[PDB]
């Protein structure tokens, strides 16, 4: 296809029409789109940011690749590299609130490598883990285990919709709530395309499997792993893999990830705090259980506003364009029979150990006047619990989408720092970016979820998308939590596109010696910056940081 | 000082003789060492390997060095910059069967961190970490809790001696024997000097404190960390802190590692396995528990000898030069009460749940005829459950370093594969490495220390350090043992200087994609080579491959 | 001399011996200085800062050396560039408040033009202007007038002491109080040395005067210049001349200073202002009367404490080391019969015109209740108006150094945002400033001084350098207020050497557009890095900016 929208920077119309012919002839032109519609989180697009904060156009592909293997993958990089084609390897490409699939670079390819690389590799009981291509959704991977009955032996760990990536997810570093809730923890063996093509397997991974004449002569992609190469992820030397997460170091198209044994006993529980107050105390409550395994997943205390952007959108609760009141949130909470904050959690393993670690909490709990207790079966019928129920067992839902909704053309962007586990530092984190979200017009919209030492506190701004004054005052908000955000001593864990600088220059403690540090290693291993240039602030020297920061 | 054995490469004696007096001018004669002694566990070396199987001098320090502060160690890396002279730093240096302190290029400045960098440098109760320097031996850190009375507030995580450090374990992915077994995987936020001689801080150690009139005018290395630096590892961006750990990337100062809170609880015990063979079937009954957190901490599987070697050297149990036979060793299990083989493991928690975990596990184990069960009381006093019921509640001993004397002039050499969590897999190891140490004339001496889905099988290759026809045995059983390994699909977690190339070849899958790829990041961060050239295998581009490896 | 307390980078002890040998060689060993105290204004230190905000030694020279004249500065770029060795010019060396003689990067050579490079080359009567060496210092220049009898005929124009050189002063875009004030406007035709060590004459400078006979073989730096070299600054093409001030592009060795004649006519006055508010109507009564020109010089609105502190040092008003109160201001401004704020000025030129110019200032300042205006007549004989009289007519004082006194060991430190004419603007930036001093504990004392679309604002903050607490408080507050400032929109137009770089990069739109431009030049200009590296936030390629940016 011959005239794209926007050509990707220093490339010819002609230089781009060798190209994609190029990759038509490798292919197929069913596999290749140009771009000469938001769509949905059921069929995502491609092209550019369905949840646009700044212009729809602002983030935009010149082209969609889907290889249909890793053999493709090698070949457009290879591509890439002759041309000096920038290319913005997705999975799934449904990262809504961070910039859905599109580039931080326009003009790049976008490189879906979930369409045809798909595949559930491996699935191995007594190791209890699983081996997925990019393109595995979370929903895919649970049909999988129902499929072959693995259900019964193994569980899944999934984020609040399951529609994402297995694999995606877990190298952004990703979260999800059973006790496997850390997912880039939770992985062991990855195979990468680096930037020069070269495939690259981590940890034991690199030890190979010894030859038998079954495997001989298979491609390297196609090779089988070595006994530990999900079992233990360091192998020998350098610890390479964390440089693969949140990075622009390479194409990641196959990983393990540790799965839970069926624990053998199950229980998910929500406990209700009556005060907007009552989240200093109950993360002080959290605190010592949390560090000694009383709570064994990442439980989430949610506000009441993101519970009743689930139930239902916010001209349903009152008319008003401002933010409802402080009165008006305890009026909403009282009508759910859910307080201003809102515990959710879960107790696995045998019921003589959940009963004790029951007990454990619901006395802990207590000291909060008014505090109230319930299972799934006490809630009503479209209740949260009921759909975190499946959550904490790793069961994929869907239902959590509708808070995005809030707002008429609800678009969503995350703000999401983290908190100490104390109740001073998040009634601290809470009121800086209150305040904030009220001198934007903006109700605040939030949940902490709780890891061990740590809470990730996903701020969830709802704005709708053809508002062009608001979506100003967005960019406005994000722009300055982010500055009060590190001048109280907290920075952000993962960010949408148009953030990305701002917040690397936050992590600038010895004049941003980890962003100079992370530069040399972009420029090493991709000297004519083709993988996505820009992601998380890192910019290969071709790339001025005058001309392309944001 | 004037004249060493032996001069770093491509360096004159002039230049040497330069160097040597700019180091001196900054941190004092008393600080500095030039060789123109084995030493002991007490006051390690720190020229060469006291655990010799190489030549004693074959791998020696042209000097020792020990800077004050970090400021020092940058100023001592732009001199080796400016000269070409390469580092190699330690901690404390008791790596012990790794090499001691000897570094891998004969000739290089032996960097001694912890002399005088050895600061607890913050204790965390409600984080429940700990800060600490090179120089922060575990007894140390012990010491530490004791004065200020965090020993029932907080727990220490101890490998098998109590002299390592802290810090240099953890960077060596060293494993211990609690719940925070996984050194490495404890920690969160690191400072390191870069090879450019930058100082960088890892995840959340980027995002900088904010301003207060009591910080300001702080050096760099002596500004505090924020708020989130010690309890969430991962920061934004490329997760780094990988390239670290048994790596040439750069020179750790400082680092955080987690601490367990006082468990509440807790109970140590053995389990004695009466046949030779009822390692497969006790393997089989670990898998299922370590996989469900019945099993809490590391529990190890000892064999007879290395519980035996503890209690006495070889010749108070026969007067046999060659190895002990199959029915030796059953007799000497009656005489010490053990089995063949002996489990190790303790319960956590309060009394509740611990009561239903070591009925869930004396369950299980029971289907092993003759298995008995005891707890620290129902053992003899110089027992090694009751050392390591010391061990695995965080406190630090020194009893079993005598197994290293079980033979005359005794060093010890680890050959540490990684074996899955099976009986099937974990006798294959044991078999091939067993009929290896046959053909030596050696006596097989190992654990296994469970980790979650994978063991680490710590051989104890024991050696007359003043037997030249045994040293030569030993190098080649270890050698043989690394292919053997490799040929059934296990590589090594760990390795002494020696076999430190030889294991990073096995480790080729795909043509070495592996090691080529750390080259890169090596030579791009390290352009002049001066931080310890060889580590795991790494060379600069300076060292021909051909003139240094093994 | 032998042996330096700090080395400049990467040179050794031997190169720097081999350095200060050659050029003890060249200056002889009277005009080269080994540092191996703070001194006066009297008599300047030229080693360090004297009014030292950092600890005394963080800013320091290794070595002096005093250029006999043009040639010893060419030897001693062309030594430096051979060696890398930095260069720290100054001319006199009194920028108090902003770092004295101190270099940027300690280890450097401070390079002291004036001790030998001290002539008033010419004082040219028909062109009113003046051309002036290093070393010629105010008081120098207004002897040279007095002895020759020119006072009748040209008058200086001066900053607030008079022993500032006349081209430092300049050079650093200074600023005095009669309608010359912009003296750095008042420039034209500058000869330098550059980097690579050649000379250059800026604008018709670079016209050369036609040959004579009795300039025949002149060096260039002894040739005289052509006509308009000092009466046209532009020159032909690129005016480059800027790119010598507050920058480190070159060594200033002459600069023509032009010279206002003798007005025939002058009269100074001072109008006090009764409330701390009343600033905000005098500013808005200043605008229209500077823009058209009824206010002549750079009148100057002092603030009540900066007078007091002229008088007597803080002990003598209180003994109270807080700051002190609203009521306690008042207090003072009645003991000294001025207002919260004192407006200072002067009329130039006949009576006839004096006259008409008075009676619209007066008119325009009688709209504020309880304004009284008095000359220097109707004033005590201590009074700083009688003292600014001299300076209104440029003749140098020293008595404006006594507030320096205000405190014990009082240190200055300059913070110097722009504001714009306007109450409004005025008053909030002082409310900044004022409520960041309250939060330090110091006292707030400054000027504003009244350019004409602009006011330079001179905070001038006082500490006690002996106080380390306090001391830590200065940065804070300078640190608190660049960052505040800048968040209103002001930026700083001069600094010291502690915060050049924060106030550098307060001027990054887009994306620090300014500064790399800034750095490709130097860079290119000084491809060694030579010349006063780190000045003003621009550091050449050889300087990391993670090891030297604060
Ligand atoms: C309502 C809502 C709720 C959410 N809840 C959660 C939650 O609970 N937990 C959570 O973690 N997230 C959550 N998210 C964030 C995001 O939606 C999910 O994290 C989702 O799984 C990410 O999209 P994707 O996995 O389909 O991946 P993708 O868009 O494919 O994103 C992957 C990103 O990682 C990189 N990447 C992906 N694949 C590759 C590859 N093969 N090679 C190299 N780089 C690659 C690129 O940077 C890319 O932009 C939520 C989002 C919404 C809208
Ligand atoms: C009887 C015996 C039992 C043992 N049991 C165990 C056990 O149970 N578990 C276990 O893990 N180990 C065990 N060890 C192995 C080893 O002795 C210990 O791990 C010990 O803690 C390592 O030495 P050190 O920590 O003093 O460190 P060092 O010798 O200081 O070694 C650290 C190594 O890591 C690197 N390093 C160290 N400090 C730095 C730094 N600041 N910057 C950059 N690189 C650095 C270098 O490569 C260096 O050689 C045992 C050893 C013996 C002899
Ligand atoms: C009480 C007090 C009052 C003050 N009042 C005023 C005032 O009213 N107005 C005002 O403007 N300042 C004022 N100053 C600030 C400063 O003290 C004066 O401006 C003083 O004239 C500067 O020092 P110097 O001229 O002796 O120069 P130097 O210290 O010699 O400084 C010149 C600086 O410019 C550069 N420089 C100097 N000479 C050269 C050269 N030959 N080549 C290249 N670069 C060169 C260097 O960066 C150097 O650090 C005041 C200071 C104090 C302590």
Redesign the pocket.
Same mark, same amino acid.
């Given at each position: 296809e011959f005239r794209p929208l926007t050509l990707p920077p220093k490339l010819s119309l002609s230089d781009f029409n060798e190209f994609i012919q190029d990759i038509i002839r490798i292919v197929g032109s069913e596999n290749v789109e140009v771009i000469s519609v938001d769509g949905s989180?059921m069929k995502p697009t491609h092209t550019h940011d369905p949840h646009h904060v700044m212009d729809q156009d602002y983030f935009l592909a010149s082209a969609i690749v889907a290889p249909r293997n890793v053999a493709d993958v090698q070949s457009i990089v290879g591509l890439a590299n002759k041309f000096s084609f920038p290319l913005?390897?997705? *999975?799934?490409?449904? @990262?809504?609130?961070?910039? &859905?699939?599109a580039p931080r670079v326009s003009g790049s390819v976008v490189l879906d490598?979930?369409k045809n690389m798909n595949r559930v590799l491996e699935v191995n009981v007594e190791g209890a883990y699983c081996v997925v291509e990019?393109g595995v959704?979370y929903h895919d991977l649970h049909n999988y285990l129902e499929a072959n009955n693995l259900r019964d032996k193994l569980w899944l760990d999934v984020?609040?919709?399951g529609?994402? *990536?297995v694999?995606? @997810?877990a190298?952004?570093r &990703?979260?999800?709530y059973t006790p496997y809730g850390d997912?880039w923890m939770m992985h062991s063996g990855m195979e990468v395309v680096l930037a020069n093509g070269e495939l690259l397997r981590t940890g034991m991974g690199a030890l190979p499997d010894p030859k038998r004449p079954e495997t001989m002569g298979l491609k390297p992609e196609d090779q089988p792993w070595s006994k530990i190469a999900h079992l233990f992820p360091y192998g020998f030397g350098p610890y390479i893999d964390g440089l693969?997460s949140?990075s622009n170091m390479?194409?990641?198209?196959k990983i393990g990830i540790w799965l839970m044994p069926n624990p053998g006993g199950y229980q998910s529980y929500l406990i209700t705090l009556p005060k907007d107050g009552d989240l200093k105390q109950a993360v002080d409550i959290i605190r010592p259980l949390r560090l000694g395994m009383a709570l064994q997943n990442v439980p989430t205390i949610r506000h009441i506003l993101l519970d009743a952007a689930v139930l239902g959108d916010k001209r349903s609760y009152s008319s008003r364009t401002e933010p409802l009141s402080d009165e008006e949130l305890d009026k909403i909470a009282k009508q759910l029979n859910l307080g201003r904050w809102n515990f959710y959690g879960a107790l696995y393993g045998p019921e003589p150990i959940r009963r004790v670690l029951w007990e454990t909490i619901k006395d802990a709990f207590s000291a909060i006047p008014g505090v109230k207790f319930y299972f799934p079966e006490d809630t009503p019928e479209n209740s949260v619990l009921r759909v975190r129920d499946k959550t904490m067992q790793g069961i994929p839902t869907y239902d959590?989408?509708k808070?995005?909704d809030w707002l008429p053309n609800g678009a969503?962007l995350?703000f999401s720092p983290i908190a100490k586990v104390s109740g001073e530092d998040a009634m601290m984190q809470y009121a800086v970016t209150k305040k904030r979200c009220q001198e934007a017009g903006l109700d605040f919209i939030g949940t902490f979820?709780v890891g061990m030492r740590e809470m990730h506190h996903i701020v969830c701004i709802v704005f709708n998308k053809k508002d062009l004054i608001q979506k100003r005052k967005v960019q406005w908000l994000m722009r300055t939590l982010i500055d009060d955000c590190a001048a109280n001593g907290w920075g952000e864990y993962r960010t949408h596109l148009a953030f990305m600088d701002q917040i690397m220059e936050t992590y600038n403690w010895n004049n941003s010696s980890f962003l100079r540090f992370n530069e040399v290693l972009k420029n090493a291993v991709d000297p004519n910056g083709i993988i996505?240039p820009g992601?998380s602030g890192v910019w290969p020297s071709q790339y001025s940081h005058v001309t392309w920061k944001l």
């Open positions: 989180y913005w390897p997705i *999975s799934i490409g449904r @990262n809504s609130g961070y910039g &859905g699939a490598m979930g990019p959704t984020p609040d919709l529609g994402g *990536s694999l995606g @997810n190298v952004e &990703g979260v999800g997912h693969f949140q390479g194409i990641v198209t959590e989408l808070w995005i969503a995350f979820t996505a992601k």
